[PDB]
Design a protein around this ligand. Structure first.
Ligand code: HEM
Ligand SMILES: OC[C@H]1O[C@H](O[C@H]2[C@H](O)[C@@H](O)[C@H](OCCCCCC3CCCCC3)O[C@@H]2CO)[C@H](O)[C@@H](O)[C@@H]1O
Ligand SMILES: *C(=O)Cc1cc2ccccc2c2ccccc12
Length: 461
């Protein structure tokens, strides 16, 4: 017995009265001030253990990896996934799906070359605009999704493709709704609120419309399949289904196929797109940073050949900028919920099997032990005296352990290549003066959404 300390819950409302009106994160952080780095809060009738500060998150996700390798539910999307797909699977199912998903993408065209192709495509599209004002939200969604579309469907979509844009539109307005205050209220009281209209029904329709698109893509694949030459993620999955016909315990069937594909879209598009969008807002607010990036781009890569992934090792400052963008961006602030896979002894407290655990990544990315000024943009957080890249234990935007972001490599490959290839060909400007640029996110929840802004991409001759 004895859970981490916490405020006295009510039978139904849990700790509702102890919460902050600003959000779940702001509630989590306010309770840390009173109860410390590891506490219990009751979101409704269920208890969750919240983990604050670098040291405590590492003590759980790294030191007791297996115990904290369990995935928790998110109320607004569970109806879609229902424990199927790689993100929300558990036990043997997750282990199977994740291993497959790693091994599949770990090896036609490499993921690096696909990203380079999208980079080239983006630069060509940005030249068209001829240095006019634009909101980069749409294009940043397109490129990120086009990487996943390349991995999954075995091709990419033109930026002004209407069906692509329509399904992109609805898929992305889903993240806006997921990160809303209303959806956070739904997290606590889904048991009652599910029978009533709300954001959750819209998120339901939007994700089902994509599941439907995936479903029929799977069928186009099943019908154009060449076993000798699997073109993408789906083909490899389908061939795996054939190999596991006789095995009754195989997880490689329809529901897992559909929802793993969505999972790769659901996870591998938005935050990447948002990180890039936040990136350029900071790059507008700090032209001198941008200038030493482009200076480093010039020195290492040139202005002729496109940037490649082995240039990163030779570009510590740009790498430090990217790290710092990711750190300050803080796109998944209270992380994605884990559960303990068994009864777990932790920091003198005992966490009962299947209890939900919240690794607050914001409290780690803003840890004053590891960063001088946690609230100020400073690529220097990741630079030593020699101007070399410097690992920082507080840096965990992809979380840690067995559940670490399955697509870390891909993300950082996207981030690097997109940032460098854009800034190689383009200098940036905005009608808003640097010192007048606001960084406060438009929405804050399980995802942070940076405010929308106008930007110029001016070709460099
Ligand atoms: C800006 C880039 C990205 C960031 C910061 C990010 C962050 C995260 C975080 C915080 C988690 C939760 C891990 C946990 O349970 O603690 C996660 C999980 C996951 N991510 Fe990402 N992500 C990014 C992009 C991607 C990409 C490009 C992919 C692949 C296409 C991807 C695929 C996944 C998957 C499959 C999981 C669940 C893995 C599991 O539960 O075992 N993500 N990511
Ligand atoms: O090139 C023309 C031929 O290709 C067609 O493919 C269509 C298909 O109808 C269809 O696959 C496609 O629509 C794709 C919508 C994009 C969905 C991807 C989203 C899913 C996740 C969230 C964001 C991206 O549009 C394609 C047009 O390029 C069809 O196969 C034919 O009708 C047509 O003759
Ligand atoms: C950024 O990738 C957004 C995001 C990722 C994610 C990854 C795994 C599980 C759940 C995730 C999210 C849930 C809710 C909102 C955003 C995300």
């Amino acid at each position: 017995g004895k859970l981490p300390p916490g405020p006295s819950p009510l039978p139904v409302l849990g700790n509702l009265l102890q919460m902050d009106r600003k959000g779940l994160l702001r509630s989590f952080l306010r309770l840390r001030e009173k109860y410390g780095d590891v506490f219990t809060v009751y979101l409704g009738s269920r208890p969750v253990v919240v983990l604050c500060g670098t040291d405590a998150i590492r003590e759980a996700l790294v030191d007791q990896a297996e115990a904290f390798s369990g995935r928790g539910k998110i109320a607004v999307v569970d109806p879609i996934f229902q424990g199927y797909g790689v993100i929300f699977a558990n036990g043997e199912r997750w282990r199977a799906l994740r291993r497959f998903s790693l091994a599949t993408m770990r090896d036609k065209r490499s993921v690096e070359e696909r990203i380079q192709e999208e980079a080239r495509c983006l630069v060509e599209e940005l030249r068209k605009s001829k240095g006019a004002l634009l909101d980069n939200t749409l294009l940043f969604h397109s490129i990120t999704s086009n990487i996943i579309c390349s991995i999954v469907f075995g091709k990419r979509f033109d930026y002004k493709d209407p069906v692509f844009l329509r399904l992109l539109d609805l898929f992305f307005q889903s993240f806006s709704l997921i990160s809303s205050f209303s959806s956070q209220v739904f997290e606590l009281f889904s048991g009652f609120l599910k029978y009533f209209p709300g954001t959750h029904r819209q998120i339901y329709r939007n994700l089902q419309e994509i599941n439907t698109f995936i479903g029929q893509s799977v069928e186009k694949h099943r019908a154009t399949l060449d076993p000798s030459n699997p073109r993408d993620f789906i083909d490899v999955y389908l061939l795996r289904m054939e190999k596991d016909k006789s095995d009754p315990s195989s997880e490689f069937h329809h529901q897992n196929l559909i929802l793993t594909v969505l999972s790769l879209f659901f996870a591998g598009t938005e935050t990447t797109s948002t990180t890039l969008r936040y990136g350029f807002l900071l790059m507008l607010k700090y032209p001198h940073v941008t200038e030493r990036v482009q200076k480093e781009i010039e020195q290492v890569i040139g202005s002729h050949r496109p940037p490649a992934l082995d240039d990163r090792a030779k570009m510590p400052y740009t790498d430090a900028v990217i790290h710092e963008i990711q750190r300050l961006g803080d796109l998944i602030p209270f992380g994605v919920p884990h559960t303990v896979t068994k009864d777990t002894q932790f920091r003198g407290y005992v966490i009962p099997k299947n209890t939900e655990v919240f690794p607050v990544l914001s409290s780690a990315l803003h840890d004053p032990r590891y960063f001088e000024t946690p609230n100020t943009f400073n690529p220097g957080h990741f630079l030593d005296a020699n101007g070399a890249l410097k690992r920082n234990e507080g840096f965990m935007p992809f979380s840690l352990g067995k559940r670490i972001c399955l697509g870390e490599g891909i993300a950082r490959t996207e981030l690097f290549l997109f940032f460098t290839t854009i800034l190689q060909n383009f200098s940036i400007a905005s009608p808003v003066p640097p010192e007048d640029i606001d960084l406060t996110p438009r929405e804050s929840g399980v995802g942070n959404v940076p405010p929308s802004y106008q930007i110029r991409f001016l070709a460099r001759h």
